[PDB]
Design a protein around this ligand. Structure first.
Ligand code: 9NK
Ligand code: ZN
Ligand code: ZN
Ligand code: ZN
Ligand code: ZN
Length: 231
């Protein structure tokens, strides 16, 4: 029961999941309510891989300061898992600090169209549903369209940690979130692909809220199908 929930906006908290694996947790206010957001940090030798910004430039500056204070290793690369602002908002801060920023070509194009910040580098090998590539200490996986058409998930083999980003919902969320960019028809099949490729996952991190087990995948499918049938 130690995962942070406790976090004023502008602040960022780190949570150690395993040796060399942390999540980062930040908050943002939207329509008068406060939402948490998760990302991932993975050690690779004496450097760090960052997965996703902390949802905004100010939060992302605080994230880098937090990392410097608590871990003290340099973030040398970062990956954004889809084109929304809680994933790419802060890429310019990362870039100014010397972090090499990455995303899939689809994510970079969608970010551009949205007027969002655009990661510098393009990830190859992730164009088709079911594609996976090794990227430093993690595997990147494109499960197919779900929360967005471009969304990636991240697996840490040394720790059996599956980071689902916003394609996976926390258990406390029982109604669909922002699905304006989603492929509702394909989302359960994409979740099916995650389960098929990472059935040994022990720790599953949603894009927002509390980690759990692989039960978060069927929970998300249930919420998405209920939203599909809404009326
Ligand atoms: O996915 C979701 O569950 C919904 C609802 C729960 C929190 C996050 N959330 C959001 O929308 C975030 C990041 S995805 C804000 C956003 C703004 C503009 C465009 C996309 C997203
Ligand atoms: Zn999103
Ligand atoms: Zn570069
Ligand atoms: Zn999100
Ligand atoms: Zn449920």
């Amino acid at each position: 029961g130690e995962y942070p929930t406790e976090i004023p906006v502008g602040e960022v908290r780190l949570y150690q999941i395993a040796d060399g694996v942390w999540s980062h947790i930040a908050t943002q206010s939207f329509d008068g309510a406060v939402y948490p957001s998760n990302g991932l940090i993975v050690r690779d030798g004496d450097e760090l891989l960052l997965i996703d910004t902390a949802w905004g430039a100010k939060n992302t500056a605080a994230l880098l300061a937090e990392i410097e204070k608590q871990i003290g290793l340099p973030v040398t690369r970062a990956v954004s898992t889809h084109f929304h602002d809680d994933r790419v908002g802060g890429v310019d801060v990362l870039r100014a600090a010397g972090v090499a920023t990455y995303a899939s070509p689809s994510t970079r194009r969608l970010a551009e169209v949205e007027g969002n910040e655009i990661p510098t580098h393009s990830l190859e090998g992730l164009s088709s549903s079911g594609d996976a590539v090794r990227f430093g200490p993690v595997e990147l996986f494109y499960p197919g369209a779900a929360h967005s058409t471009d969304n990636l998930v991240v697996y840490v083999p040394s720790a059996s940690v599956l980071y689902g980003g916003c394609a996976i919902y926390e258990l406390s969320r029982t109604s669909a979130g922002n699905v304006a960019d989603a492929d509702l028809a394909e989302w359960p099949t994409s979740i099916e692909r995650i389960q098929q490729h990472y059935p040994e996952a022990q720790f599953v991190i949603p894009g927002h809220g509390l980690p759990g087990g692989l039960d978060l995948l069927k929970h998300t499918t249930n919420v998405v199908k209920a939203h599909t049938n809404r009326s």
